[PDB]
Scaffold this active site. Structure first.
Site, PDB file in Angstrom:
ATOM      1  N   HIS A  42       0.839  -1.193   0.000  1.00  0.00           N
ATOM      2  CA  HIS A  42       0.000   0.000   0.000  1.00  0.00           C
ATOM      3  C   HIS A  42       0.885   1.259   0.000  1.00  0.00           C
ATOM      4  O   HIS A  42       0.834   2.123  -0.876  1.00  0.00           O
ATOM      5  CB  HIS A  42      -0.997   0.012   1.129  1.00  0.00           C
ATOM      6  CG  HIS A  42      -1.976   1.151   1.047  1.00  0.00           C
ATOM      7  ND1 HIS A  42      -3.147   1.239   1.723  1.00  0.00           N
ATOM      8  CD2 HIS A  42      -1.976   2.256   0.243  1.00  0.00           C
ATOM      9  CE1 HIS A  42      -3.834   2.315   1.408  1.00  0.00           C
ATOM     10  NE2 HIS A  42      -3.121   2.947   0.505  1.00  0.00           N
ATOM     11  N   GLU A  96       0.956   8.149  -4.084  1.00  0.00           N
ATOM     12  CA  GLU A  96       1.805   7.793  -2.894  1.00  0.00           C
ATOM     13  C   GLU A  96       3.040   8.702  -2.869  1.00  0.00           C
ATOM     14  O   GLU A  96       3.474   9.150  -1.772  1.00  0.00           O
ATOM     15  CB  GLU A  96       2.181   6.322  -2.944  1.00  0.00           C
ATOM     16  CG  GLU A  96       0.916   5.455  -2.718  1.00  0.00           C
ATOM     17  CD  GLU A  96       0.323   5.691  -1.373  1.00  0.00           C
ATOM     18  OE1 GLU A  96      -0.893   5.901  -1.213  1.00  0.00           O
ATOM     19  OE2 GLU A  96       1.062   5.701  -0.364  1.00  0.00           O
ATOM     20  N   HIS A 100       3.253  11.204   0.246  1.00  0.00           N
ATOM     21  CA  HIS A 100       4.071  10.555   1.285  1.00  0.00           C
ATOM     22  C   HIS A 100       5.514  10.536   0.879  1.00  0.00           C
ATOM     23  O   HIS A 100       6.324  10.934   1.753  1.00  0.00           O
ATOM     24  CB  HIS A 100       3.641   9.121   1.581  1.00  0.00           C
ATOM     25  CG  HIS A 100       2.352   9.013   2.269  1.00  0.00           C
ATOM     26  ND1 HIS A 100       2.091   9.417   3.518  1.00  0.00           N
ATOM     27  CD2 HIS A 100       1.146   8.473   1.827  1.00  0.00           C
ATOM     28  CE1 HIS A 100       0.870   9.188   3.912  1.00  0.00           C
ATOM     29  NE2 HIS A 100       0.279   8.591   2.887  1.00  0.00           N
TER      30      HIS A 100
END
Length: 208
Positions: A42, A96, A100
């Site tokens: 993930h 992502e 992040h």
């Protein structure tokens, strides 16, 4: 995180696809096919020791797939998207990195190092094999939360964090496993803090 240290550690989070595709929403397969029946990445998320985390840290470095062209087939196999609409994966990976990965530019200096770090972590933490080894199989049984926890902790030596969701019939199931990684990205550590959430005592492992 103090001083000029940007964040304290990472969660490295893997997800079971059968608990993405049995919920009240439709999941979609990516354009390369139904994924293998295995945990997928993930994400690899910078986090701090008070339960807060950095996010969207560098809007002047948007995701660029030509920088990770050598990793893409590994990324197709080991980090597939099951969100709708069907796609190649680039939407997920873009997301992502922007939210992040941009916040881990102090430690993992460029996109290629960020994505290759998450793929090297998946390759040493084989969750399926570990679970299978304790006779815990995605066969739709309910399993005690403590057994899954202890099986992973016995194999890797650090306590994971298990997050559950609920399937279409309201049953609480194994969704995602978080393992923590130090602030350098070099080694597994006991998490300094765990995320919120509830699993309850016995949880399904859905087929996929």
């Amino acid at each position: 995180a103090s001083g000029s240290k940007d964040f304290d550690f990472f969660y490295f989070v893997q997800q079971w696809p059968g608990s993405y595709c049995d919920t009240k929403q439709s999941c979609c397969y990516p354009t390369t096919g139904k994924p293998a029946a295995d945990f997928g990445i993930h994400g690899l998320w910078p986090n701090n020791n008070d339960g807060t985390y950095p996010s969207n840290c560098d809007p002047n470095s948007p995701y660029d797939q030509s920088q990770i062209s050598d990793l893409i087939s590994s990324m197709q196999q080991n980090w597939p998207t099951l969100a709708c609409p069907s796609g190649s994966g680039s939407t997920f990976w873009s997301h992502e990195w922007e939210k992040h990965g941009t916040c881990a530019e102090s430690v993992l200096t460029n996109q290629h190092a960020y994505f290759k770090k998450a793929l090297d972590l998946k390759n040493q933490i084989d969750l399926l094999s570990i679970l299978q080894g304790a006779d815990i199989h995605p066969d739709g049984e309910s399993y005690d939360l403590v057994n899954i926890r202890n099986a992973i902790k016995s194999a890797i030596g650090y306590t994971p964090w298990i997050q559950c969701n609920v399937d279409q019939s309201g049953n609480s199931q194994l969704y995602q496993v978080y393992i923590c990684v130090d602030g350098s990205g070099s080694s597994l550590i006991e998490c300094p803090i765990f995320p919120g959430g509830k699993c309850g005592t016995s949880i399904e492992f859905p087929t996929f």
